[PDB]
């Protein structure tokens, strides 16, 4: 039944999020905590409760949680806080949320007895737990070979994150198994560092544009230095080797902007 599988991709990638909402919502309009996963894929569920995604804006909010770098995240905490005391209770988030739409997670993460005393660090932990659980679920959909996904699986994860229907890269994807006749696998930490790096490309785009308006020849040591600099993550050479083998379309050895970085940035925009 591929005709529904491919049909869901265009709506989940391009339509308005209420059209994505009512297509996966059954309670009526409400989703479950598990309708959200089908809405984002073609335990923290026990914490979400049943009062979730009332007016498809908890969808928007947790989408923002999935799509926000850290310097964009602390300033989101700034724009939550009205008086600027450094705390955001559930009441201030209710006041913001009424403006957004114009509570089972508010009872979970802010306070039990309508008592929200929220530091920056808890708000950081929220994003880290949520995104790491989503990244673990995506790592385990592809059934890792004892915690080691294959090369075509990781390439499919990268293409699913890029969101661009490139038939050229689709052709490269099934060639990836043929290029590297041996594949040792891709561990969860190699994924965990590299998507952390991919989260922050628009910050990485600073030194990349510094490089770029001179020349467009991206090597592995520069990317690893900026990864360990900005994201403080380590990229193994197998990972950059897979990235070079997948995305270097002209095969000149080193990547340009419009091969990889411009497309990933455009994904970060929309």
């Amino acid at each position: 039944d591929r005709k529904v599988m491919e049909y869901e991709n265009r709506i989940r990638a391009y339509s308005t999020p209420d059209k994505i909402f009512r297509y996966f919502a059954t309670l009526k309009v409400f989703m479950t905590p598990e309708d959200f996963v089908r809405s984002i894929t073609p335990s923290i569920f026990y914490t979400l409760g049943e009062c979730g995604l009332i007016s498809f804006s908890d969808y928007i909010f947790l989408t923002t949680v999935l799509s926000t770098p850290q310097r964009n995240f602390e300033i989101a905490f700034k724009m939550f806080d009205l008086n600027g005391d450094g705390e955001v209770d559930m009441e201030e988030f209710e006041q913001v949320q009424s403006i957004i739409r114009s509570s089972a997670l508010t009872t979970y993460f802010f306070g039990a007895d309508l008592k929200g005393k929220l530091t920056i660090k808890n708000f950081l932990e929220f994003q880290r737990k949520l995104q790491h659980d989503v990244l673990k679920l995506e790592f385990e959909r592809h059934d890792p070979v004892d915690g080691r996904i294959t090369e075509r699986q990781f390439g499919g994860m990268l293409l699913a994150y890029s969101g661009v229907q490139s038939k050229k890269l689709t052709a490269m994807q099934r060639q990836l198994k043929k290029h590297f006749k041996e594949g040792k696998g891709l561990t969860f930490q190699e994924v965990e560092n590299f998507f952390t790096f991919l989260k922050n490309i628009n910050d990485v785009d600073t030194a990349l544009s510094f490089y770029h308006m001179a020349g467009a020849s991206l090597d592995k040591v520069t990317m690893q230095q900026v990864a360990r600099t900005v994201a403080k993550v380590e990229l193994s050479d197998h990972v950059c080797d897979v990235v070079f083998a997948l995305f270097d379309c002209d095969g000149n050895g080193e990547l340009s902007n419009k091969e990889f970085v411009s497309i990933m940035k455009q994904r970060l925009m929309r």
Binding site: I60, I100, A214, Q225
Partner: protein, 291 residues
């Protein structure tokens, strides 16, 4: 094709290698197209770039030099990247230029930039500014940060005195005409209808207002967060929430005449709301340099 603008505003050269003045650098910042390239041997190089410590290291440094400066194409692109860089990437670019990890940039970093230039295929001003005559002096982060902000602030001042026409103040017509510099002509003329009709006298626009506004326009993508929030929520942004968003973005309050004049500009319909789409699109057209 950024080499071709360096071909344009070159005015002195050495051994086939085109150079510029600091004045040609400032014209490459602002002016579109205008000179005659003349040749320089080593004695000319010494007589031009001698006495760099005579220039004051404040915010008038290229105006302190005038023509006294020769800029390589590497330094040309380096300073253009400084002009395009937001405030946040400062220490990041410093540590990316800290390959040896010694809390410093050294002369081998500039030679590695020239290695990049060579793979894409002579003592200059910034070499004396940051490393002395032969590179023996060092370069830390504080001088680097102060140099970047002084460069950007002096560009702000030079554009301010251009569009203010020598005054210490601006009118709202000058602010609108500067602000709508890289706009397409049809939307520009609809904005000029908005200037002729909806803009009023107001008052004079000072220097620190323009400085804070340029500091706003270097943080547009981080400003775009609440924009896309109330865009996908389809809340048309009013001026009061816009005050809060600008204060959270920049960390500094704009004055109310700035916000009033901007709201008179970007409200085409007059419907007391914000068309943020054309706003951000022509704004990202507007704040792109190299042109």
């Amino acid at each position: 094709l950024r080499k071709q603008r360096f071909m344009q505003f070159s005015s002195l050269e050495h051994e086939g290698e085109y150079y510029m003045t600091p004045r040609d650098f400032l014209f490459s910042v602002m002016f579109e197209q205008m000179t005659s390239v003349k040749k320089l041997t080593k004695k000319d190089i010494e007589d031009t770039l001698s006495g760099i410590q005579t220039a004051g290291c404040g915010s008038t440094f290229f105006r302190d030099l005038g023509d006294k400066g020769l800029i390589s194409y590497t330094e040309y692109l380096f300073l253009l990247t400084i002009l395009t860089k937001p405030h946040s990437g400062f220490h990041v670019a410093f540590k990316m230029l800290d390959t040896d990890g010694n809390e410093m940039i050294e002369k081998r970093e500039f030679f590695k930039l020239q290695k990049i230039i060579s793979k894409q295929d002579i003592n200059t001003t910034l070499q004396m500014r940051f490393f002395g005559k032969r590179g023996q002096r060092k370069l830390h982060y504080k001088e680097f940060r102060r140099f970047m902000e002084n460069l950007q602030t002096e560009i702000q001042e030079m554009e301010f005195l251009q569009f203010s026409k020598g005054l210490s103040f601006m009118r709202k017509e000058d602010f609108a005409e500067w602000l709508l510099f890289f706009t397409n002509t049809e939307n520009k003329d609809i904005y000029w209808k908005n200037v002729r009709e909806k803009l009023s006298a107001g008052e004079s626009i000072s220097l620190d207002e323009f400085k804070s506004f340029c500091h706003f326009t270097t943080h547009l993508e981080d400003f775009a967060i609440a924009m896309q929030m109330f865009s996908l929520a389809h809340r048309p942004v009013r001026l009061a929430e816009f005050k809060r968003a600008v204060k959270v973005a920049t960390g500094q309050e704009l004055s109310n005449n700035i916000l009033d004049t901007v709201f008179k500009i970007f409200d085409l319909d007059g419907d007391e709301c914000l068309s943020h789409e054309e706003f951000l699109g022509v704004l990202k057209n507007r704040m792109h340099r190299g042109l």
